[PDB]
Design a protein around this ligand. Structure first.
Ligand SMILES: Nc1ncnc2c1ncn2[C@@H]1O[C@H](COP(=O)(O)OP(=O)(O)O)[C@@H](O)[C@H]1O
Ligand SMILES: [Mg+2]
Length: 462
């Protein structure tokens, strides 16, 4: 079957690149998302600049440049990072930003497919004495890096971070409103970041830092047994540096297998505790996986691999951007499904400067990135539409409200490749509704108190 790189070339509309307008929007996303995971995950307040230039008017080629102050990239890792598409998606053991498996490499591939300039990289790891520079292409036939230029320059006191520029076919007039909306919505749940955006018309927007409070980062965990299939077991075995016995393999390579549990799993699966794991047959792997799926006594997938926005930042962002009369939020306790942890957070903003409409403004997030297209098909949209807001104190048919929901997990379920809608998985839908109801009860209280005070002034004051 086809490699991911070859599947993308044939089916770019399934990977976020159906046309030049979406190509331009998706490239901006990939760059900003890499810069955020290079900063806040490592304790650094993100300082990020985004520029888009029209470089060829008739052919509509645009150059996209994103600069950050993150941890940088060891020079020997650069060529593969941007110029070699992996043969598969690796098992997720830590929460990260992004929907697409190819990541920034899809923008690089699209660039080399349709025009002639190389991508431009400048990077400096923490404490580096040099900034390392590169001009690079991916070989569209071979799936390997081509180093066009490679250099370095003396660094300055305290500097670290990365600059990436990519030249692509685009369509700014079509993409414009959705690119502005992408950046706005990122800023709402990232009030500790600072952004500068210069667009192709020369317009500049400044999005200032509002706080220095950064949420606890996600941590790497070992895989949970309910999450691994036969091929993933094989990958884990082949990766071992040491000659583990099956027993040693169970306790050291997985979540929720202590000494006693391992003994039980081994008996149930008809396996020898002291047999070397590199010698496990195909039949023996099948029994292991079937034992995993049947075993009823594992701890829930650990939430150590996840990272929340937090009630305090959600509320701060909603207040500063919308200037509402009221705002409230909830970060729920962790759940789990199919061997992976998940958490839902929700928020509402009401009144004030928010526009009068007949429906709420709905904001959707997944592992800290906004979802922009395909909103009417999303489970979050369904849950919000189905709630009866009259039960929660909203009285007119016309009102001023923003609602947001964030889902985080090491396995986000999407409906269709190339659409930005979260699937209607029962366990997740139920928890999103529980969360929205928790926040809506806080609104019901606000509104009941407000109406009491208005009635009191009307009836008791001269
Ligand atoms: N701005 C950056 N700062 C630090 N590292 C980066 C940056 N951009 C890309 N990288 C590195 O290159 C790797 C490949 O990027 P990408 O193709 O988007 O895959 P992914 O983000 O899913 O890991 C990243 O995992 C990261 O290590
Ligand atoms: Mg990425």
């Amino acid at each position: 079957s086809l490699s991911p790189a070859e599947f993308f070339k044939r089916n770019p509309e399934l990977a976020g690149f159906p046309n030049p307008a979406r190509a331009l929007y998706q490239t901006v996303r990939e760059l900003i998302e890499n810069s955020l995971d290079a900063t806040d995950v490592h304790g650094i307040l993100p300082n990020i600049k985004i520029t888009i230039d029209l470089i060829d008017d008739a052919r509509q080629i645009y150059k996209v440049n994103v600069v950050d102050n993150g941890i940088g990239i060891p020079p020997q890792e650069v060529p593969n990072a941007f110029g070699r598409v992996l043969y598969s998606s690796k098992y997720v053991n830590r929460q990260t930003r992004g929907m697409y498996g190819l990541g920034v490499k899809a923008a690089v591939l699209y660039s080399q497919m349709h025009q002639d300039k190389p991508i431009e990289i400048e990077t400096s790891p923490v404490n580096s004495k040099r900034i390392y520079t590169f001009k690079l292409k991916i070989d569209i036939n071979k799936n390997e890096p081509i180093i066009v230029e490679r250099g370095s320059v003396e660094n300055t006191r305290g500097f670290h971070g990365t600059s990436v520029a990519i030249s692509i076919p685009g369509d700014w007039p079509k993409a414009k409103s959705r690119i502005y909306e992408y950046i706005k919505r990122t800023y709402i749940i990232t009030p500790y970041a600072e952004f500068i955006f210069k667009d192709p018309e020369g317009n500049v927007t400044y999005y200032p830092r509002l706080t220095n409070k950064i949420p606890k980062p996600p941590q790497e965990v070992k895989p949970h047994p309910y999450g691994v299939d036969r091929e993933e077991i094989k990958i884990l075995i082949n990766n071992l540096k040491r000659d583990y016995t099956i027993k040693e393999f169970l306790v050291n390579e997985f979540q929720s297998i202590g000494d006693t549990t391992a003994d039980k799993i081994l008996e149930l699966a008809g396996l020898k505790p002291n047999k070397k794991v590199k010698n496990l047959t195909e039949e023996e792997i099948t029994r292991l996986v079937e034992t995993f799926k049947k075993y009823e006594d594992f701890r829930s997938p650990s939430a150590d691999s996840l990272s929340v926005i937090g009630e305090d930042l959600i509320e701060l962002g909603l207040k500063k951007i919308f200037n509402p009369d009221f705002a409230a939020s909830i970060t729920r306790k962790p759940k789990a499904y199919q061997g992976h942890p998940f958490i839902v957070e929700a928020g509402v903003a009401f009144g004030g400067s928010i526009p009068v409409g007949e429906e709420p403004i709905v904001l959707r997030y997944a592992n800290k990135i906004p979802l922009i297209y395909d909103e009417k098909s999303d489970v979050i949209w369904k849950v919000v539409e189905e709630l009866d807001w009259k039960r929660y104190g909203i009285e007119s048919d016309q009102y001023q409200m923003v609602v947001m929901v964030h889902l985080c997990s090491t396995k986000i379920p999407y409906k269709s490749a190339g659409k930005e809608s979260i699937a209607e998985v029962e366990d997740i839908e139920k928890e999103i509704k529980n969360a929205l109801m928790e926040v809506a009860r806080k609104l019901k209280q606000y509104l009941s108190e407000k109406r009491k005070e208005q009635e009191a002034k009307k009836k008791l004051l001269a």
